[PDB]
């Protein structure tokens with residue numbers, strides 16, 4: 001059976017190249033796909049390739065995910081995160097194909113404490129989340145044989161993330177400043193991709209699991225304590241990390257163009273029972289990518 | 299459900315840490331496991347931890363795999379590859395636990411051309427293969443709720459392999475010399491680990507798949523052409539690879555302590571239909587680890 005993949009060079013995407021490889025026959029494409037259209041800024045183009053290949057399963061790891069830039073260029077985010085997905089969905093539903101699609105917790109507003117659920121109310125603080133929410137609604141309404149994975153604080157060892165950018169700073173710098181109020185759960189590309197593969201195989205054999213799932217690594221943490229642990233691991237790996245004065249903060253002290261949510265604690269209890277899958281503590285995943293990075297010899 | 303893993307720091311093993319993480323609750327251990335015995339040179343010790351944790355599933359990625367060294371130190375290979383496995387199996391069967399275990403094509407003799415099957419005859423040319431064959435027979439006879447994965451030419455991006463050692467040479471050297479007669483299929487840790495995860499989930503729900511499976515990447519190739527492609531990829535990634543004169547060879551021109559088989563073409567048609575899984579062409583897997591290696595910035 002035929003799997004079709006977009007956004008193959010991204011974090012998740014690069015990992016789905018590995019994870020989907022045995023699940024079924026894999027065509028993997030990106031923006032720069034030359035013999036085949038993987039360009040999300042052309043909804044009809046990506047719609048044409050879905051129609052053109054007739055995939056059994058479609059994994060969409062392509063997107064517009066430049067959150068702050070999206071506020072400045074929103075109509076483009078709409079094209080990528082709503083319009084192309086909408087088109088992709090409507091195409092998929094003609095061939096009866098499963099559409100797998102990634103979404104975000106930025107769908108939710110802040111308002112902290114209790115962790116967010118799949119049947120909870122949606123009020124996007126920012127554009128990224130408003131646009132992406134449209135995409136998941138658009139998919140929801142054009143193709144019910146869909147799988148939507150709302151995730152958060154996504155990192156991978158190959159591709160830009162918080163731990164990547166945070167570490168670069170820490171090696172260069174003596175004294176550093178970052179957020180301690182934003183509660184949430186860092187989630188690996190590896191986990192996303194591995195669970196995706198297992199989820200697909202369940203869905204094929206049980207269409208009932210079609211729907212919306214909150215899929216994020218276990219537990220919760222702050223961007224601060226996220227970064228602290230990142231440093232301990234750098235430290236642990238003997239690296240002379242320039243940092244001698246680590247400084248915590250509450251959000252609003254430092255500006256960002258888009259409004260970030262304060263309560264990014266997603267509840268995944270649905271995914272676990274539905275797919276019979278485990279979702280381990282966020283740290284483990286993080287230490288794993290860091291170990292691989294700190295193995296620095298060619 | 300509880301998964302138990304040995305040889306977690308090896309090629310396959312490190313990848314199983316990732317792949318098993320969502321399949322079930324994961325205890326991962328090695329030789330140097332301190333609060334828990336992951337030392338295969340003590341069969342009773344590793345037997346004690348199986349009994350001690352009572353795992354639902356046991357993945358054994360630990361082994362003695364130093365093939366030439368094994369000829370010199372065979373009684374030790376027996377301890378690791380036969381004795382400990384035997385013990386592990388017999389323990390597992392008391393708790394009714396699935397034993398997952400990796401084996402080799404070195405189980406087979408040379409005698410080329412036609413690709414090797416699961417119900418074909420076994421005549422190990424070398425010790426490694428003779429010892430490992432004992433282990434898989436020992437497991438076969440103490441624990442029928444087992445999964446045996448005979449693989450070959452196993453590489454990974456973290457841990458020593460042919461492509462790793464071949465490349466080191468090529469960057470250092472002008473003129474280089476390697477084998478073109480040994481036919482076989484390079485197989486990633488990633489693939490091994492990903493398929494293992496899917497296989498476990500099938501086995502739980504269908505005990506009938508218990509048995510012996512040839513699990514190796516698709517197609518076939520020579521160690522020479524393996525290495526050539528490795529260089530093209532190094533070259534392709536702009537690397538000034540010292541190599542100006544690449545030299546092919548037929549086996550016997552260069553000595554090795556152990557006898558290597560000439561026909562390492564494994565047939566995997568059984569695995570594919572039994573697990574409903576795909577086993578893609580060997581190149582893809584290889585290019586993937588190489589791309590990740592040639593992404594050289596921290």
Ligand SMILES: NC(=O)C1=CN([C@@H]2O[C@H](COP(=O)(O)OP(=O)(O)OC[C@H]3O[C@@H](n4cnc5c(N)ncnc54)[C@H](OP(=O)(O)O)[C@@H]3O)[C@@H](O)[C@H]2O)C=CC1
Pocket residue numbers: 007008009010011012013030031038039040041060061062063064065080101102103104105151152153154155159
């Ligand atoms: N990163 C995170 O923390 C989060 C991600 N997600 C979702 O998970 C999925 C994957 O995330 P992740 O892998 O982290 O994000 P990445 O940015 O790493 O991947 C998104 C992909 O979209 C590609 N892309 C950009 N513009 C276009 C375009 N016009 N046409 C086609 N592709 C394009 C990007 O490539 P490039 O820009 O390099 O050309 C990239 O390959 C997406 O749906 C995303 O919204 C959800 C919440 C969290």
Ligand SMILES: NC(=O)C1=CN([C@@H]2O[C@H](COP(=O)(O)OP(=O)(O)OC[C@H]3O[C@@H](n4cnc5c(N)ncnc54)[C@H](OP(=O)(O)O)[C@@H]3O)[C@@H](O)[C@H]2O)C=CC1
Pocket residue numbers: 305306307308309310311328329336337338339358359360361362363378399400401402403449450451452453457
């Ligand atoms: N590499 C290949 O091409 C092949 C591998 N296989 C099988 O696949 C499985 C994994 O292979 P692979 O991951 O490639 O091999 P690795 O050598 O990378 O892994 C084997 C593991 O065994 C560990 N080990 C060595 N001595 C002991 C000991 N006394 N007690 C416990 N662990 C020990 C090794 O660690 P360390 O030595 O670093 O301490 C290592 O973690 C094994 O069953 C192997 O036989 C089969 C055929 C092909």
Ligand SMILES: Cc1cn([C@H]2C[C@H](O)[C@@H](COP(=O)(O)OP(=O)(O)O[C@H]3O[C@@H](C)[C@H](O)[C@@H](O)[C@H]3O)O2)c(=O)[nH]c1=O
Pocket residue numbers: 065067068104105106151152153154161162177178179182223254260
């Ligand atoms: C500029 C700056 C940022 N930061 C921190 C604040 C932010 O809350 C934190 C997170 O940074 P980024 O992950 O780069 O922002 P981002 O918008 O890319 O993050 C989000 O991307 C979406 C695609 C996801 O749905 C989210 O789950 C999340 O990953 O970086 C500082 O601590 N100090 C600073 O000076």
Ligand SMILES: Cc1cn([C@H]2C[C@H](O)[C@@H](COP(=O)(O)OP(=O)(O)O[C@H]3O[C@@H](C)[C@H](O)[C@@H](O)[C@H]3O)O2)c(=O)[nH]c1=O
Pocket residue numbers: 363365366402403404449450451452459460475476477480521552558
């Ligand atoms: C010394 C030397 C080796 N080589 C090549 C010859 C060998 O056939 C080739 C393979 O090397 P290695 O993989 O290091 O040998 P090895 O014994 O570790 O290889 C085997 O390990 C077992 C664990 C597996 O079951 C096998 O499938 C295979 O991976 O290296 C040369 O080409 N030129 C040389 O001068």
Ligand SMILES: [Mg+2]
Pocket residue numbers: none
């Ligand atoms: Mg990896």
